[PDB]
Amino acid sequence: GSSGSSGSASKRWSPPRGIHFTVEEGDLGFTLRGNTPVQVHFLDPHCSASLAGAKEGDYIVSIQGVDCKWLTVSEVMKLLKSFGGEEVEMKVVSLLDSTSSMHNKSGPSSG
Q: How far apart are CA 79 and CA 62, in angstroms?
A: 10
Region of 61 (left: φ > 0; alpha: ψ -120 to 50; beta: rest) is: alpha
Technique used? NMR
Burial (Cβ within 10 Å: 0-12, 13-18, ≥19) of residue 50? buried
* Three-class DSSP labels, 41-103: CCCCCCCCHHHHHCCCCCEEEEECCEECCCCCHHHHHHHHHHCCCCEECEEEECEECCCCCCC
State the Cα angle at 64 between 3 and 68, rounded to 5°: 70
Q: How far apart are CA 105 and CA 63, in angstroms?
A: 45
The domains of the chain, with CATH numbers, are 1-111 (2.30.42.10)
